[PDB]
Amino acid sequence: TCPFYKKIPGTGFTVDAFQYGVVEGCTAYFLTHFHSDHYAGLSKHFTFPVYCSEITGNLLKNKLHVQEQYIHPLPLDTECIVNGVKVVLLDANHCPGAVMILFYLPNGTVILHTGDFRADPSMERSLLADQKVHMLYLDTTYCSPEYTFPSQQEVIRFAINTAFEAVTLNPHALVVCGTYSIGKEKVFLAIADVLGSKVGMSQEKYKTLQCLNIPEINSLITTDMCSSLVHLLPMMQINFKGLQSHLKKCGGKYNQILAFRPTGWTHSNKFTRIADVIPQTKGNISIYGIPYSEHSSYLEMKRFVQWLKPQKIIPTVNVGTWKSRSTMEKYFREWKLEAGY
């Protein structure tokens, strides 16, 4: 049965609620983004209207084979009427195709559902600027002050400089980057651009990337691994055993691997600056964990909420423990007392 924080009151609508069977009273199912915890339950046999971005609808049709007649893609930044209710989709600054959803309820209440997001000051000049929001359904993934990480731009600067140094010292080194979902594509695209290479990958991953409307993508990726010196592998293979095995397969073209694992936050963030990050190494293999986040840091989240000044906050992440819930509620009251709303 569907939890309350996936239902939008005063509507026939749910958000990210495909794993509960037929939800009583639901006339339209919204999907914020194509990550498995959110799409869990969708398949070619789904026969209700799904509302989403264009990029998410390309992935639904090609990867999960949802039939076209039930996919309802909406443009961003545009007022749309769905089953008699005004909605807007906003970029979430998460993975490709990820949205926030503004619902304008028939009684005058305005609700923002962030989906998964990385708050940014640019959102203070979207269509959010124009009216009051009563209720905020908030991605609280990193809602505690220990969660610090650098900007995406600093992280990419580190990765490009590291890869270009390594490969210029040793033209026979291979670069490998881990992946298990969409998101974080800048990591491997920025490294391949500095090296003058396409990114090589499996047929299944190439197919996924071809649904993302990234400009000039045919110029940047390939399934011909022999032609590429930046390879993508499943995240589970980014370890000394898996990388050794991969290097065997390349037929003596390479004699060193430099590998990247884009994680979210790890506790090595509480001590070390991006500048000072070092790899784990075994023989001719080195592995870097780099803190490339597609969720808000604590400070980014706090700025957003203190700007928006919602009347009520409903967390959508970390909701399963009383300790988590009490922590989050304490920070929400602090922010409200400090800002004065």
Between CA 151 and CA 59, with CA 139 as vertex, the angle to 5 degrees is 85
- Least Å distance between CB 19 and Ni ion? 15
User: Whose Cβ is closer to Ni ion: residue 5's or residue 164's?
Assistant: 5
User: Whose Cβ is closer to Ni ion: residue 35's or residue 231's?
Assistant: 35
Q: Comparing C-alpha atoms, which of 279, 262, 268, 188 is closest to residue 232? A: 188
User: Whose Cβ is closer to Ni ion: residue 35's or residue 198's?
Assistant: 35
Residues 6+ apart with CB under 8 A from 95: 33, 34, 35, 116, 181, 182, 183, 184, 294
The whole-angstrom separation of Cα 138 and Cα 319 is: 11
User: Whose Cβ is closer to Ni ion: residue 76's or residue 160's?
Assistant: 76
User: Whose Cβ is closer to Ni ion: residue 35's or residue 205's?
Assistant: 35
Residues 6+ apart with CB under 8 A from 286: 257, 258, 259, 279, 280
- Name which of residues 26 to 85 contact Ni ion (CB under 5 A): 35
The stretch among 55-63, 115-123, 161-169, 201-209 that binds Ni ion (CB under 5 A) is 115-123
- Name which of residues 158 to 217 contact Ni ion (CB under 5 A): none
Residue with tokens 């076209």: 68
The whole-angstrom separation of Cα 16 and Cα 294 is: 18
SS3 100: strand
Binding mask 262-301 for Ni ion (x = CB under 5 A): ----------------------------------------
Residue 265 CB neighbours (<10 A) = 18
The stretch among 45-53, 112-120, 128-136, 247-255 that binds Ni ion (CB under 5 A) is 112-120
User: Whose Cβ is closer to Ni ion: residue 184's or residue 303's?
Assistant: 184
Contact status: 118 vs Ni ion (CB under 5 A): no
- Least Å distance between CB 38 and Ni ion? 6
- Least Å distance between CB 141 and Ni ion? 9
Query: Site for Ni ion (CB under 5 A): which residue of 116, 139, 185, 300?
Result: 116
The whole-angstrom separation of Cα 287 and Cα 219 is: 27
Residues found near Ni ion in the complex (CB under 5 A) = 35, 116
